[PDB]
Design a protein around this ligand. Sequence first.
Ligand SMILES: COc1cccc(C[C@H]2CCCNC2)c1
Length: 358
Amino acid sequence: KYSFKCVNSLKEDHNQPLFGVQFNWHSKEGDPLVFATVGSNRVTLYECHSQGEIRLLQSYVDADADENFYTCAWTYDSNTSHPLLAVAGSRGIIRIINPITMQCIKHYVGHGNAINELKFHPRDPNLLLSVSKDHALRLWNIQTDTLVAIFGGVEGHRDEVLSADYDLLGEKIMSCGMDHSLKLWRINSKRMMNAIKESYDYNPNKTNRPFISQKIHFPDFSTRDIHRNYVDCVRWLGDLILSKSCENAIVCWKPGKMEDDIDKIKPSESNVTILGRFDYSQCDIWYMRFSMDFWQKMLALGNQVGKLYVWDLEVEDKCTTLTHHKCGAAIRQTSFSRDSSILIAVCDDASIWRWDRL
Ligand SMILES: COc1cccc(C[C@H]2CCCNC2)c1
C-alpha cells in the first residue's frame, strides 16, 4: 500500500482561498520539481527541495485586483520544449505565462465569463480546453491564437461547466457542471480533425479572412443519472469515467449498458453502468477536486476539515487518510509530482501542505 508524511507547510500572505495546484509534469531530466498555485489575483511558482523545503520561485500578480484565478494547466513549446503555464478565472481571460520570467506572453478572451477549468490535449500541446460559467466549452490553438470550436447550445450544458477531461488519446471530451449532467463531445470526427488542420494553416498577418470556428451544439452522449447535484470534477480512467458531486462519493461509471463499447455509443443512449464508488466524509461542500498521479494508480481528494484521502486503484475490490493537527481548512485541490514522490494540497486559508511518499 501507500504511506505519506507531512514534511512542510506554508501560507501565502493574501489569505484568499487557493483554488488550484499543478506540478509541472513537463519538466526536464535534472531540473527540480516545480508546482504552481492559483488564488486571488495571484499565480505563484514553487520549487520542491530536499529536507522537505518549499522554495518560492516567483509570482505573477495580475494588474486587475478584482481578478480571481480558479485554474492552471501546464504545457510546453513543441519546438523548444520550454514549459508554459495557462491560467484563467473569474474574468474569463486565459493568460499564457512564461514560468522563467512570469511574462504574460499570450492572452485569450472567449467572452468576459468566468473560466472554471483549463486542460491541455494529451497529444497536441497547443490544444487548450476551457470550461466556462456561460455553459460552454472552448477549444483553443495557442500556436496560432485561434478558437477552433465552441461546444454548447440548447442541447449542451444548461448551467455552468465546472470541469472537463480528455480521454487517453484526446479523441473525446467528458464535461460536467451545475446542471448535474456529464456530456461527451467527440473531437476525432473528419470535421474536428480538419478544423484542427485549418487552425494550424491560419495567419491573420497574411490574410483578410477571419478564423471560422466550429459550433458544436449537440453532445455525443449525455447523462443526469450519476449524481443528484453539481458535478465539480471529472476524469477519464481508460474507457471509464471518475466523477464526483458534493454527495461524499467519487463514482466510477461508463456510458451505455455493461458490455457497450464507448465508440459504439449513439447520442440517443439512455443507459449508464456504475462500476464502483469511493466513499468518504466531510466533502459535502461544492468545488472540491480530486486528482490522480501520472500512472492513474492513485486517487487523492481533500475534504472540508483538512483531511486528505488517498486510494490505491491497483487493489482487488483500499483507502488511507492524511491528517496534521494544524490542518483544518478545506483542501480545494491536490497535485502529485510526475514521479509520485510528493503530494501537494492547497487550502481555503491560502496554506500549502507537503506530503512525501515513504
Ligand atoms: C477547487 O474546486 C473547484 C471545482 C469546480 C470549479 C472551481 C472554480 C470555482 C471557484 C468558486 C466559484 N465557482 C467556480 C473550483
